[PDB]
DNA sequence: CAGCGGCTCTAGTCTGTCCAGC
DNA sequence: TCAGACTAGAGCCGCTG
RNA sequence: GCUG
């Protein structure tokens, strides 16, 4: 912790004297004998998170279901739509289809 | 998910009542031009406007635009367009559609120099 | 391309030439489809221009 | 019950375009150059004195810009119109005339109208022959009433100075380095010097870097060199929280390893690091007083006001490591716009100083050599330095002013005449700063801060995408304010001088700083009373209406900005769920009883700014007004610009389609103007039987596109 | 070890790190403590506006600024404490608002310096200063009236 | 296909986390054959994959934990006779996270690469406490180096692999089975192949340089095939395997993974005029003269 | 909101208006006061106000490391010369305080001696910050450096003003309790002021010209 | 007790950034 | 503008004699 | 600068 000299207000440093450890100024004679226990606790943050991930419900919390893919026609699906390329005047879609775990991903 | 689920539900209903002979429906079925997203987007509901795969980032301090309250995480405050292109976009919604659209031009430009 | 505004411009213009009006197409406003549909049927054309 | 509507509120927009907007942004900068800034340049350079043979001196009293004139073969001169300049390939220019006081042995000889050069006069400015004419008298001049002006004619080509987008100088950026460290910088541009200074954390300890130091130096040595010698008073300024002290801790432990405990020792340390362009002590002490953080004033080598500023920087670096609130350059409050008059001001200051130094050189050659006759400098006033400096810079578009290290290129473009919209479109363009260096995809994106200031859709498709941008229909760019009454008011609203306190107050939660243009004015408690009272003093006309004030509660500052170049937009004031604007007020405006300026005075309309609409809550429509609303949007179609204003029903179209029409609509064949048959151009396209659009915007009626249309109904 | 020269922990209100073993006040509370709870006299230090609402009396001018150095001794005004903690300094026809300044916690000493002779004189410490008051014009009321 | 890849999003390797480069920057990373890439990911298969209690043990043997993350406080103590820095371990949090560390092990985490701290200077007075008696650095420093250690001693690594930033458990969704694979975001394949309880025969890596250094040129050759084909399939492109096969055989026929950069081409191609007609056109022509 | 409590009269005193200074010590907390410490000198320049003080620090108290005090005094002063010397004894006896000037004008600042039911204002001639000086360390280095071996004009202008020496009377001394009465002004309880007669609209136009 | 040597680390520097039209 | 994988240096400590 |  920062502690400052009552005289000149520079920063104190800890050093050792002939009877005690002392807080001492570098620029004036002031010293302070450490007579008793003094402490300073930082209290850092623990890495609490355990975090399992990748569950199927965490995958299918998106709108689409019971639609039709051009590959395997299954109802349990995971869709996507894009437009951010205006060279493509047509729309852009991508689909995931996982009822039979077939796993297509096309345009 | 709730918003995207609402969009999916509003799209199915429109297709169910669209009569055969609706020209837009034909071009989607035969695959010559368009898709069921495009039909649902101009009749029923334009989607969540997404920039780099996420809802609209805060371009002011803790809010997207000054028209919404700070820290608000509501649908319309972050780019959900509840209007279709038939009903016409609101000042606020139009700006969101344009922004997601502009990521289109930005990506195409970047790819060309590198891919060459 | 979803240029629904071209489809409305054709309809608003048609209802306009038939009665000597300029229909407005201002952003976030403009003349509505429900108004121009009734102008076409008054002049004997189909309300959706077909 | 529904909230009632005032349906005539749209009329505020035609009343606004009579005075601001419609290419006035360009005209109201050039007018400010030739009517005031040309006098400040002369005032800062009013005396010249030859080093050899003193007590002989030339003095400048006043400067005039005059009216356009052509100089002909037998020295006959006659006034000229803009169209005669287009045909004969000459430059549309007015003579700079100056009056001088100088010595011919008799120590006061005067000249009242010495021509020292010629100034290109921008069309429809205060000295152009077109201004204030009626449409029947434009016909005598072969000019079109709808032609916007805002451009020059130099050697018969029409050249536009484009609006340049810039970063705001004198502002603390806090940003990440390439290596993922966090640092800070402040580009400290003053009229006498521009310089950058950086705050780096390269080993967990704070170093200051500058180009006049051969190596970057520990910040505690700079504090000690500025005369805050005690380590305690340094840490009081930086901050007194335990984690802020723990972060600054390893930097005290560096200075205590060196023998730097005294101001003289610290100045000696800096002296042995200075790159050489008294030695150690004064090349350091002068450097801190004049070049490091040069925008912060030190009056008589008192460094207290600079210590508080460099403490603010270090604290923001510390609190940006614990959470990565790095700032974004893309927010438009930070961006600034430099117009025609502010570029020409720099060019003329360079040319006038080269003129005085060339004339000083002439005096130094002839006075201690040639003749007993006390020569008059009038015989050496060669005009060509001013005229050819102006005309070459405007024609070529390169502005290499070595005085301010500026080497911009591509500043001017030829005004496009493919159509009426192509000309008016070009007058609203905003070139960016990066200028296509590489595919960044960061400033090319549409930032939400562009709301109502810059057009969403009108951007090129191609490599320029997102870097060329256009103004919206209802935007205004501020000029530079007098800056005087803002200080005299603020010092009465309970602000306290920062010299009267130690560091520690800056770390209290109830103490906010006040900044004016990056110079701290002091500290205040109860910032809400300050901000509210300052806005009231603005609304009642005691403070100029373009002065914006806003709060940042995350970093505890109140900012007051009075500099020119920031986008303003008008809004209606709303108090207690009721809009100030009323149907009766709109009816009076239609009758002409009241004007847009009257609305500003009666506190019915005020100009918000991109840093200030960060605080405000703005209703789009009257039915959206809630309990905490401060402003109401005048007309929301003015979010779109000029070219996008041709599109019927743009809100029913997918957004890339609108962008393409904004490109195609500049290229459509049509009608340039009424003078189009008396006009000789490199290439002109006309449609034989044009028709006006059967479906049209209100924007088409404001810009008068249906007077000279470009298309046919099919 | 000397108990009155302990090392300075950095927050000056929190100087004691080693031992033998705050909220914010408002101007209504400050004046109430020094009237009822404790009759002891205390030195405030207040900052007035740059111009007071007066004319320099016979001072040979131009509508120049008016300061406390120009006025004459006597009653200068009245200080009102209202309900709800509002405090006003009525200093003429106009009322100025009074609010608490930054809470200083370093030592401040109010001292006289008198050069009673050409080269020598007396320096006298009159007391410590603890609280700062800020006086400001009430721009809303001054303007609303006219 | 690189011109068709719109730099799409909505890709997270199936784990609602662990973002990956894909599209043109991923193809660019493969063909450059750079020794380090963004987000290198090691997929570790667990042998006793039955239940989560076994996964969290071996996750804790690879994922880095710092000393500060397991200590409930660190304190400086100044006494009249000596001064030291003390660290008390939170043995409750050790007992939950299933780590194999105690006070006697933390003495072995310290003494390596930490200002030449002596073994004698570190004491283990109880099963929960450690004390580090500071010594003069005797090189550009003052004995007051306690203020260095007070910010440095928490960041020492007590357990795990230093190159691993994080690890995550992933669960399958097939009806037939449920087993947990471990995804490692880090760049030491050899260490993850050698921790007790990872099935080392079936772990893989994105990074061709790691696979080459650990498993040889023929495993690196297959990784170029697998990774290009993975990137193409995600963007819905399809290429016959014989094209990506030839590309990988071209990059590995000289025994080292050579990039398609100018540096790799200078090791593959002998011709001066071929080399001078791509990049560095001056230097190749003066070298051929010399 | 009626003025239900403490209608307080406010008076103005001029008897100290050219004498009264605010000294403040940015690094010394409000509880540690120099009231006990014996002061050895006070120096002032009355124009370009720059006060300097010297305070004595004792040596028989335990907080003084005499071994280090002998060393620092030997660095500053040559071992036995004592014709000119910062410290008379072989130890560091004194701390010197050097002022910085806060503001050029002080016209708007007033000290306010509160008494029950009344407030007494008095103008300030100056506001100075007093800091502990580290010049003695620089002198010690200069002695070592010699053994081992515009700011110029502006400082010479400040050297023209001759030092004024002052006798220091601390807060305990009866002269402090005496002169503290000159912050009051003799006057009647109720007086209507001849000045300050301006109206709100004249006052607004005066502060906002 | 001293000296190679490789490691290891700064950091320094030169080297690219689509095709084409007007 | 943004890496980027080369090329020397400065060391470093510790066996290597 | 724009088109491709
Ligand atoms: Zn000290
Ligand atoms: Zn499928």
mmCIF file of N, CA and C in Angstrom, chain F residues 201-287:
data_model
loop_
_atom_site.group_PDB
_atom_site.id
_atom_site.type_symbol
_atom_site.label_atom_id
_atom_site.label_comp_id
_atom_site.label_asym_id
_atom_site.label_seq_id
_atom_site.Cartn_x
_atom_site.Cartn_y
_atom_site.Cartn_z
ATOM 1 N N UNK F 201 -4.715 -41.017 -29.337
ATOM 2 C CA UNK F 201 -4.761 -41.510 -30.704
ATOM 3 C C UNK F 201 -5.834 -40.854 -31.560
ATOM 4 N N UNK F 202 -6.765 -40.105 -30.974
ATOM 5 C CA UNK F 202 -7.876 -39.569 -31.746
ATOM 6 C C UNK F 202 -8.071 -38.070 -31.569
ATOM 7 N N UNK F 203 -7.131 -37.378 -30.937
ATOM 8 C CA UNK F 203 -7.138 -35.925 -30.934
ATOM 9 C C UNK F 203 -6.495 -35.346 -32.194
ATOM 10 N N UNK F 204 -7.011 -34.192 -32.623
ATOM 11 C CA UNK F 204 -6.613 -33.532 -33.863
ATOM 12 C C UNK F 204 -6.447 -32.042 -33.601
ATOM 13 N N UNK F 205 -5.919 -31.332 -34.599
ATOM 14 C CA UNK F 205 -5.686 -29.901 -34.504
ATOM 15 C C UNK F 205 -6.031 -29.234 -35.829
ATOM 16 N N UNK F 206 -6.435 -27.959 -35.759
ATOM 17 C CA UNK F 206 -6.554 -27.151 -36.971
ATOM 18 C C UNK F 206 -5.207 -26.869 -37.618
ATOM 19 N N UNK F 207 -4.161 -26.708 -36.821
ATOM 20 C CA UNK F 207 -2.952 -26.028 -37.256
ATOM 21 C C UNK F 207 -2.006 -27.058 -37.867
ATOM 22 N N UNK F 208 -1.714 -26.892 -39.160
ATOM 23 C CA UNK F 208 -0.830 -27.810 -39.875
ATOM 24 C C UNK F 208 0.591 -27.786 -39.342
ATOM 25 N N UNK F 209 1.034 -26.660 -38.783
ATOM 26 C CA UNK F 209 2.394 -26.602 -38.259
ATOM 27 C C UNK F 209 2.530 -27.421 -36.977
ATOM 28 N N UNK F 210 1.509 -27.383 -36.110
ATOM 29 C CA UNK F 210 1.504 -28.220 -34.912
ATOM 30 C C UNK F 210 1.461 -29.696 -35.262
ATOM 31 N N UNK F 211 0.638 -30.066 -36.242
ATOM 32 C CA UNK F 211 0.499 -31.467 -36.616
ATOM 33 C C UNK F 211 1.785 -31.982 -37.255
ATOM 34 N N UNK F 212 2.461 -31.137 -38.039
ATOM 35 C CA UNK F 212 3.745 -31.509 -38.635
ATOM 36 C C UNK F 212 4.817 -31.732 -37.573
ATOM 37 N N UNK F 213 4.928 -30.805 -36.622
ATOM 38 C CA UNK F 213 5.925 -30.893 -35.560
ATOM 39 C C UNK F 213 5.682 -32.078 -34.630
ATOM 40 N N UNK F 214 4.431 -32.499 -34.465
ATOM 41 C CA UNK F 214 4.076 -33.579 -33.554
ATOM 42 C C UNK F 214 3.931 -34.939 -34.230
ATOM 43 N N UNK F 215 3.368 -34.995 -35.440
ATOM 44 C CA UNK F 215 2.968 -36.257 -36.051
ATOM 45 C C UNK F 215 3.560 -36.509 -37.427
ATOM 46 N N UNK F 216 4.327 -35.582 -37.975
ATOM 47 C CA UNK F 216 4.986 -35.802 -39.239
ATOM 48 C C UNK F 216 4.188 -35.354 -40.442
ATOM 49 N N UNK F 217 4.866 -35.427 -41.593
ATOM 50 C CA UNK F 217 4.410 -34.772 -42.812
ATOM 51 C C UNK F 217 3.140 -35.420 -43.344
ATOM 52 N N UNK F 218 2.947 -36.713 -43.093
ATOM 53 C CA UNK F 218 1.806 -37.393 -43.677
ATOM 54 C C UNK F 218 0.520 -37.126 -42.907
ATOM 55 N N UNK F 219 0.613 -36.828 -41.613
ATOM 56 C CA UNK F 219 -0.555 -36.364 -40.881
ATOM 57 C C UNK F 219 -0.873 -34.916 -41.196
ATOM 58 N N UNK F 220 0.148 -34.103 -41.463
ATOM 59 C CA UNK F 220 -0.074 -32.724 -41.880
ATOM 60 C C UNK F 220 -0.745 -32.672 -43.241
ATOM 61 N N UNK F 221 -0.393 -33.618 -44.115
ATOM 62 C CA UNK F 221 -0.980 -33.697 -45.445
ATOM 63 C C UNK F 221 -2.482 -33.957 -45.376
ATOM 64 N N UNK F 222 -2.910 -34.841 -44.467
ATOM 65 C CA UNK F 222 -4.331 -35.125 -44.294
ATOM 66 C C UNK F 222 -5.072 -33.944 -43.678
ATOM 67 N N UNK F 223 -4.403 -33.174 -42.815
ATOM 68 C CA UNK F 223 -5.046 -32.031 -42.173
ATOM 69 C C UNK F 223 -5.340 -30.909 -43.167
ATOM 70 N N UNK F 224 -4.483 -30.714 -44.173
ATOM 71 C CA UNK F 224 -4.766 -29.756 -45.243
ATOM 72 C C UNK F 224 -5.993 -30.193 -46.034
ATOM 73 N N UNK F 225 -6.110 -31.496 -46.301
ATOM 74 C CA UNK F 225 -7.295 -32.041 -46.966
ATOM 75 C C UNK F 225 -8.542 -31.835 -46.117
ATOM 76 N N UNK F 226 -8.486 -32.235 -44.840
ATOM 77 C CA UNK F 226 -9.649 -32.127 -43.961
ATOM 78 C C UNK F 226 -10.079 -30.688 -43.734
ATOM 79 N N UNK F 227 -9.131 -29.768 -43.607
ATOM 80 C CA UNK F 227 -9.505 -28.420 -43.208
ATOM 81 C C UNK F 227 -10.034 -27.589 -44.374
ATOM 82 N N UNK F 228 -9.467 -27.755 -45.571
ATOM 83 C CA UNK F 228 -10.014 -27.086 -46.750
ATOM 84 C C UNK F 228 -11.411 -27.602 -47.048
ATOM 85 N N UNK F 229 -11.597 -28.920 -46.977
ATOM 86 C CA UNK F 229 -12.888 -29.532 -47.269
ATOM 87 C C UNK F 229 -13.942 -29.146 -46.237
ATOM 88 N N UNK F 230 -13.546 -29.019 -44.967
ATOM 89 C CA UNK F 230 -14.445 -28.529 -43.921
ATOM 90 C C UNK F 230 -14.918 -27.103 -44.197
ATOM 91 N N UNK F 231 -13.998 -26.222 -44.587
ATOM 92 C CA UNK F 231 -14.346 -24.831 -44.878
ATOM 93 C C UNK F 231 -15.235 -24.702 -46.111
ATOM 94 N N UNK F 232 -14.973 -25.500 -47.150
ATOM 95 C CA UNK F 232 -15.801 -25.471 -48.356
ATOM 96 C C UNK F 232 -17.220 -25.970 -48.091
ATOM 97 N N UNK F 233 -17.360 -27.046 -47.310
ATOM 98 C CA UNK F 233 -18.673 -27.634 -47.044
ATOM 99 C C UNK F 233 -19.561 -26.695 -46.221
ATOM 100 N N UNK F 234 -18.978 -25.949 -45.272
ATOM 101 C CA UNK F 234 -19.755 -25.021 -44.443
ATOM 102 C C UNK F 234 -20.373 -23.898 -45.265
ATOM 103 N N UNK F 235 -19.644 -23.367 -46.242
ATOM 104 C CA UNK F 235 -20.200 -22.349 -47.123
ATOM 105 C C UNK F 235 -20.987 -22.931 -48.283
ATOM 106 N N UNK F 236 -21.347 -24.210 -48.224
ATOM 107 C CA UNK F 236 -22.132 -24.886 -49.239
ATOM 108 C C UNK F 236 -21.466 -25.094 -50.577
ATOM 109 N N UNK F 237 -20.181 -24.783 -50.706
ATOM 110 C CA UNK F 237 -19.441 -25.158 -51.893
ATOM 111 C C UNK F 237 -19.120 -26.648 -51.854
ATOM 112 N N UNK F 238 -18.856 -27.218 -53.026
ATOM 113 C CA UNK F 238 -18.364 -28.583 -53.091
ATOM 114 C C UNK F 238 -17.274 -28.698 -54.140
ATOM 115 N N UNK F 239 -16.195 -29.386 -53.778
ATOM 116 C CA UNK F 239 -15.054 -29.626 -54.651
ATOM 117 C C UNK F 239 -14.786 -31.120 -54.615
ATOM 118 N N UNK F 240 -14.442 -31.692 -55.765
ATOM 119 C CA UNK F 240 -14.006 -33.076 -55.802
ATOM 120 C C UNK F 240 -12.716 -33.192 -55.003
ATOM 121 N N UNK F 241 -12.599 -34.289 -54.249
ATOM 122 C CA UNK F 241 -11.479 -34.491 -53.334
ATOM 123 C C UNK F 241 -10.126 -34.479 -54.046
ATOM 124 N N UNK F 242 -10.088 -34.858 -55.326
ATOM 125 C CA UNK F 242 -8.853 -34.900 -56.101
ATOM 126 C C UNK F 242 -8.199 -33.545 -56.306
ATOM 127 N N UNK F 243 -8.933 -32.446 -56.155
ATOM 128 C CA UNK F 243 -8.297 -31.141 -56.263
ATOM 129 C C UNK F 243 -7.593 -30.745 -54.972
ATOM 130 N N UNK F 244 -8.260 -30.885 -53.823
ATOM 131 C CA UNK F 244 -7.611 -30.573 -52.551
ATOM 132 C C UNK F 244 -6.501 -31.574 -52.239
ATOM 133 N N UNK F 245 -6.599 -32.790 -52.779
ATOM 134 C CA UNK F 245 -5.539 -33.788 -52.664
ATOM 135 C C UNK F 245 -4.253 -33.323 -53.333
ATOM 136 N N UNK F 246 -4.354 -32.879 -54.588
ATOM 137 C CA UNK F 246 -3.204 -32.387 -55.342
ATOM 138 C C UNK F 246 -2.576 -31.153 -54.710
ATOM 139 N N UNK F 247 -3.399 -30.250 -54.167
ATOM 140 C CA UNK F 247 -2.872 -29.069 -53.484
ATOM 141 C C UNK F 247 -2.030 -29.455 -52.275
ATOM 142 N N UNK F 248 -2.530 -30.386 -51.465
ATOM 143 C CA UNK F 248 -1.788 -30.839 -50.295
ATOM 144 C C UNK F 248 -0.537 -31.621 -50.665
ATOM 145 N N UNK F 249 -0.601 -32.422 -51.734
ATOM 146 C CA UNK F 249 0.597 -33.180 -52.183
ATOM 147 C C UNK F 249 1.650 -32.191 -52.689
ATOM 148 N N UNK F 250 1.209 -31.102 -53.321
ATOM 149 C CA UNK F 250 2.141 -30.052 -53.814
ATOM 150 C C UNK F 250 2.843 -29.391 -52.623
ATOM 151 N N UNK F 251 2.122 -29.169 -51.519
ATOM 152 C CA UNK F 251 2.708 -28.435 -50.363
ATOM 153 C C UNK F 251 3.556 -29.347 -49.469
ATOM 154 N N UNK F 252 3.582 -30.664 -49.711
ATOM 155 C CA UNK F 252 4.303 -31.548 -48.805
ATOM 156 C C UNK F 252 5.291 -32.485 -49.486
ATOM 157 N N UNK F 253 5.484 -32.386 -50.803
ATOM 158 C CA UNK F 253 6.362 -33.330 -51.483
ATOM 159 C C UNK F 253 7.840 -33.118 -51.186
ATOM 160 N N UNK F 254 8.239 -31.962 -50.666
ATOM 161 C CA UNK F 254 9.630 -31.748 -50.292
ATOM 162 C C UNK F 254 9.882 -31.992 -48.816
ATOM 163 N N UNK F 255 8.944 -32.634 -48.124
ATOM 164 C CA UNK F 255 9.117 -33.042 -46.749
ATOM 165 C C UNK F 255 8.741 -32.013 -45.711
ATOM 166 N N UNK F 256 8.508 -30.773 -46.111
ATOM 167 C CA UNK F 256 8.124 -29.699 -45.215
ATOM 168 C C UNK F 256 6.864 -29.058 -45.777
ATOM 169 N N UNK F 257 5.989 -28.574 -44.900
ATOM 170 C CA UNK F 257 4.798 -27.873 -45.366
ATOM 171 C C UNK F 257 5.181 -26.492 -45.871
ATOM 172 N N UNK F 258 5.208 -26.340 -47.188
ATOM 173 C CA UNK F 258 5.571 -25.091 -47.842
ATOM 174 C C UNK F 258 4.324 -24.323 -48.244
ATOM 175 N N UNK F 259 4.296 -23.037 -47.926
ATOM 176 C CA UNK F 259 3.177 -22.199 -48.289
ATOM 177 C C UNK F 259 3.083 -21.929 -49.779
ATOM 178 N N UNK F 260 1.966 -21.310 -50.166
ATOM 179 C CA UNK F 260 1.752 -20.799 -51.516
ATOM 180 C C UNK F 260 2.203 -19.332 -51.539
ATOM 181 N N UNK F 261 2.966 -18.920 -50.534
ATOM 182 C CA UNK F 261 3.535 -17.580 -50.541
ATOM 183 C C UNK F 261 4.733 -17.508 -51.488
ATOM 184 N N UNK F 262 5.275 -16.293 -51.644
ATOM 185 C CA UNK F 262 6.524 -16.105 -52.386
ATOM 186 C C UNK F 262 7.687 -16.880 -51.776
ATOM 187 N N UNK F 263 7.677 -17.091 -50.458
ATOM 188 C CA UNK F 263 8.752 -17.834 -49.811
ATOM 189 C C UNK F 263 8.650 -19.325 -50.084
ATOM 190 N N UNK F 264 7.435 -19.873 -50.092
ATOM 191 C CA UNK F 264 7.273 -21.274 -50.431
ATOM 192 C C UNK F 264 7.565 -21.565 -51.890
ATOM 193 N N UNK F 265 7.162 -20.655 -52.777
ATOM 194 C CA UNK F 265 7.386 -20.816 -54.208
ATOM 195 C C UNK F 265 8.864 -20.751 -54.565
ATOM 196 N N UNK F 266 9.643 -19.941 -53.842
ATOM 197 C CA UNK F 266 11.087 -19.901 -54.032
ATOM 198 C C UNK F 266 11.792 -21.176 -53.591
ATOM 199 N N UNK F 267 11.187 -21.971 -52.717
ATOM 200 C CA UNK F 267 11.737 -23.274 -52.383
ATOM 201 C C UNK F 267 11.272 -24.379 -53.321
ATOM 202 N N UNK F 268 10.126 -24.217 -53.974
ATOM 203 C CA UNK F 268 9.603 -25.220 -54.891
ATOM 204 C C UNK F 268 10.116 -25.046 -56.313
ATOM 205 N N UNK F 269 10.209 -23.810 -56.797
ATOM 206 C CA UNK F 269 10.440 -23.529 -58.207
ATOM 207 C C UNK F 269 11.881 -23.085 -58.430
ATOM 208 N N UNK F 270 12.538 -23.713 -59.402
ATOM 209 C CA UNK F 270 13.932 -23.426 -59.717
ATOM 210 C C UNK F 270 14.098 -22.261 -60.688
ATOM 211 N N UNK F 271 13.114 -22.015 -61.553
ATOM 212 C CA UNK F 271 13.269 -21.077 -62.664
ATOM 213 C C UNK F 271 13.326 -19.627 -62.189
ATOM 214 N N UNK F 272 14.341 -18.894 -62.658
ATOM 215 C CA UNK F 272 14.484 -17.477 -62.327
ATOM 216 C C UNK F 272 13.338 -16.660 -62.905
ATOM 217 N N UNK F 273 13.026 -16.862 -64.191
ATOM 218 C CA UNK F 273 12.006 -16.044 -64.847
ATOM 219 C C UNK F 273 10.605 -16.331 -64.332
ATOM 220 N N UNK F 274 10.348 -17.544 -63.842
ATOM 221 C CA UNK F 274 9.083 -17.795 -63.156
ATOM 222 C C UNK F 274 9.026 -17.013 -61.854
ATOM 223 N N UNK F 275 10.102 -17.090 -61.069
ATOM 224 C CA UNK F 275 10.186 -16.392 -59.792
ATOM 225 C C UNK F 275 10.159 -14.879 -59.969
ATOM 226 N N UNK F 276 10.865 -14.370 -60.977
ATOM 227 C CA UNK F 276 10.884 -12.944 -61.263
ATOM 228 C C UNK F 276 9.593 -12.424 -61.878
ATOM 229 N N UNK F 277 8.665 -13.286 -62.284
ATOM 230 C CA UNK F 277 7.410 -12.813 -62.852
ATOM 231 C C UNK F 277 6.260 -12.900 -61.869
ATOM 232 N N UNK F 278 6.552 -13.009 -60.573
ATOM 233 C CA UNK F 278 5.502 -13.031 -59.560
ATOM 234 C C UNK F 278 5.690 -11.902 -58.554
ATOM 235 N N UNK F 279 6.723 -11.963 -57.718
ATOM 236 C CA UNK F 279 7.011 -10.953 -56.709
ATOM 237 C C UNK F 279 8.520 -10.874 -56.566
ATOM 238 N N UNK F 280 8.995 -9.764 -55.980
ATOM 239 C CA UNK F 280 10.424 -9.470 -55.787
ATOM 240 C C UNK F 280 11.219 -9.574 -57.087
ATOM 241 N N UNK F 281 10.723 -8.894 -58.124
ATOM 242 C CA UNK F 281 11.247 -9.051 -59.476
ATOM 243 C C UNK F 281 12.669 -8.537 -59.642
ATOM 244 N N UNK F 282 13.123 -7.619 -58.789
ATOM 245 C CA UNK F 282 14.495 -7.134 -58.890
ATOM 246 C C UNK F 282 15.486 -8.107 -58.263
ATOM 247 N N UNK F 283 15.188 -8.582 -57.049
ATOM 248 C CA UNK F 283 16.143 -9.361 -56.262
ATOM 249 C C UNK F 283 16.477 -10.695 -56.913
ATOM 250 N N UNK F 284 15.481 -11.370 -57.487
ATOM 251 C CA UNK F 284 15.738 -12.632 -58.177
ATOM 252 C C UNK F 284 16.623 -12.461 -59.405
ATOM 253 N N UNK F 285 16.550 -11.314 -60.082
ATOM 254 C CA UNK F 285 17.358 -11.133 -61.285
ATOM 255 C C UNK F 285 18.804 -10.785 -60.957
ATOM 256 N N UNK F 286 19.046 -10.045 -59.874
ATOM 257 C CA UNK F 286 20.422 -9.785 -59.462
ATOM 258 C C UNK F 286 21.080 -11.016 -58.850
ATOM 259 N N UNK F 287 20.311 -11.868 -58.165
ATOM 260 C CA UNK F 287 20.862 -13.111 -57.625
ATOM 261 C C UNK F 287 21.267 -14.080 -58.727
#
